[PDB]
Write a protein that binds this DNA or RNA. Structure first.
Length: 46
DNA sequence: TGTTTTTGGTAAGA
DNA sequence: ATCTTACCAAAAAC
């Protein structure tokens, strides 16, 4: 239905970014997606 | 004009 | 203020 905002490629690039200690809140402004989307794909339990 | 799927503002948090 | 999370109305898509 609705196209995702982040494809499996980013799901890895972003994951890496966050693994290097990157702020989801910033990792969102820049990319374009909202913070809830990001926390949903990358729980703080990640 | 209608169903699906995923988004995102947002309130809420022993 | 700051960080997390699940909602759930609805944008996006056909």
């Amino acid at each position: 239905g609705r196209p995702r905002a982040i494809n499996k490629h980013e799901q890895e690039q972003i994951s890496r970014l966050l693994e290097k200690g990157h702020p989801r809140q910033q990792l969102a402004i820049i990319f374009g997606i909202g913070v809830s989307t990001l926390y949903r794909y990358f729980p703080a339990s990640s």
